[PDB]
Subunit: 360 residues, 2 copies
């Protein structure tokens, strides 16, 4: 490939930078300290663990390249203390520091693609055994979960054990916490689950053993709220609300956290909704004048969730396994289920592995 | 008590506020919407679950008090739709919206007191069985963990099972994740544990079965860094670093996250350090010019950790159970241990419960 072959490589700027001219005619710049830190030799790097052995205390932050050789596919660098490093062209190209290359790689790692929905949702559906058996189907399943926030699996048995069977096949680890002490447990006001936790459970897997649920796309609701009621959006995305879960589950517990109901990342993108009205504390840590406008904003948020254009209604049949993003969807309803929760890290892990397996 | 008895109560500002004059001569202001939202009657509130039954859609955000009666200890309110609410004086007083009362209550819920340390640390120590048996001792144990970041328990057996025994007695739930699939598992470069997780494990419990560890107070290090090297502190508290844990543990896994090495809350206070050099990815999602100054800053951070004034050294003896804050401490060392991790929510829960039991 023209994009991935080296036409020229040289040290620049007191040898503190390496510039690559690709046959593509594209150009890339690599800091010497980063190349040294990421030497793939066996003194510096453990292949089997994919881990860096090099210590920060061994790294000269003012290092420059002493000598550089290249061909079409490799760069060969000598350091001032005679350490020697070889870098592959493809490895360098992927890790290029341009905004375009970095953003491309981030998309590949974190799967940010998102499809918003409302009442017009076609509930994504795949066969249970297909997902159990074949990488392509398991991959479709998880990528749809991440993109859409919900996927249905049909054709599981109507017997207990299917959630555990699915977990084992996927290599999932399931969460336990107060109110959900076992990995798999038997199960109108829209809510997310367990906002009293500092890190609410990411993904829920529900299996219908014996048999309406309503759901909204929280990210879609937030986007409409920001447009129609910007001040409401500002209040809900900036006000820390106390959530409190007090009870007994083999022991007495008092689980408490503060969350913004609309949780944004550094770029102002919604990453989680934290909302259960039952669990919202009587304790409200805001100046008195902030209180009534907070409730006005909450009312607008909840009005939007209850609007006909937002809500999707569905019925769970025996053998259905529904999986959903508890950070994104809110649910409610106006029954023998088995359910488990997983951390998003476990699900994203599987998504990454499966994508690699499908691509090969 | 003079502070907690009502000299006068009245509706103000179109009945949208309730003002309380305490016999103390202090004054408090309560929004009508918040009083309505927090009606303790059995239509609105579930005592046993300590949960609100009232729906957001049933709450008039523009509500005002229709009628108000009071005595020394209670307020009796009638709403415009004839709903009726009684509030206790002590309950109101505690939930007062003044900055002083709110901050007091937050301290009581979240235990923010923090004692920084270095090489001069006297390792807090309590007896294992004492902690197992008596609330006062268990309370001292957990409050010291939260304040100091580390506590040693002495006088456990030198046999396996003590971590599990301690967990059961405390009603703890233990975490599992890739690299630590069992609740209790057998176990120089300063690091925190498992930063590749979006929510790294909060608390570690280590029990020495058969027998130097070094530790630093990460919060103390950050405070010194901010003072001596403010630009380094700024870089480390604002730059998202990729952490990556790839391997096999019953299944193939690829766990990945981005963290600021120095993680601040909204008020600029350090809440977590996320740092393991082995796990820090080769992938670095920053503009090229940001790279070398990041490494310079990291080097200053690590230099500070390795300085003689920062490091505390100790040896684990058989029967020792060491507990520490994995969000705060970094550790390393230049051996038969059993270990478990817990979420801070589980530990804070126990701390709250124990404080109430000790106070009674
Ligand atoms: Zn090397
Ligand atoms: Zn009521």
């Amino acid at each position: 490939s023209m994009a991935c072959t080296i036409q020229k490589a040289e040290a620049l700027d007191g040898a503190h930078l390496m510039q690559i001219l690709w046959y593509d005619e594209e150009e890339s710049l690599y800091p010497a300290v980063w190349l040294r830190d990421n030497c793939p030799c066996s003194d510096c790097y453990l292949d089997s663990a994919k881990a860096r052995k090099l210590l920060v205390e061994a790294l000269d932050v003012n290092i420059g390249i002493k000598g550089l050789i290249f061909d079409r596919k490799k760069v060969y660098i000598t350091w001032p203390d005679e350490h020697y490093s070889e870098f592959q062209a493809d490895w360098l190209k992927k890790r290029c520091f341009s905004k375009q290359a970095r953003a491309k790689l981030q998309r590949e790692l974190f799967f940010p693609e998102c499809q918003y929905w409302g009442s017009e949702l076609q509930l994504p559906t795949l066969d249970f055994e297909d997902v159990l058996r074949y990488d392509e189907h398991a991959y479709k399943w998880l990528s749809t979960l991440k993109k859409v926030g919900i996927v249905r699996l049909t054709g599981a048995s109507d017997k207990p054990g299917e959630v555990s069977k699915l977990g084992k096949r996927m290599g999932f680890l399931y969460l336990t916490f107060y109110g959900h002490t076992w990995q798999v447990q038997d199960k109108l006001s829209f809510h997310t689950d367990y906002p009293a936790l500092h890190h609410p459970p990411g993904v829920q897997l529900l299996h219908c053993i014996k048999q309406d649920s309503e759901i909204v796309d929280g990210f879609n609701v937030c986007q409409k709220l920001k447009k129609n009621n910007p001040q409401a959006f500002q209040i809900l995305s900036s006000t820390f609300v106390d959530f409190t879960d007090i009870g007994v589950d083999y022991c007495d517990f008092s689980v408490q956290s503060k969350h913004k109901i609309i949780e944004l990342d550094d770029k102002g993108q919604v990453v989680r909704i934290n909302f259960n009205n039952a669990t919202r504390d009587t304790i409200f840590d805001v100046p008195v004048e902030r209180v009534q406008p907070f409730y006005a904003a909450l009312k607008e948020f909840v009005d939007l969730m209850n609007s006909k254009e937002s809500k999707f209604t569905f019925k769970m049949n025996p053998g259905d396994v529904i999986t959903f993003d508890n950070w994104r969807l809110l649910h409610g309803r106006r029954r023998h289920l088995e359910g488990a929760y997983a951390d998003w890290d476990v699900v994203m892990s599987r998504l990454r592995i499966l994508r690699q397996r499908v691509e090969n």
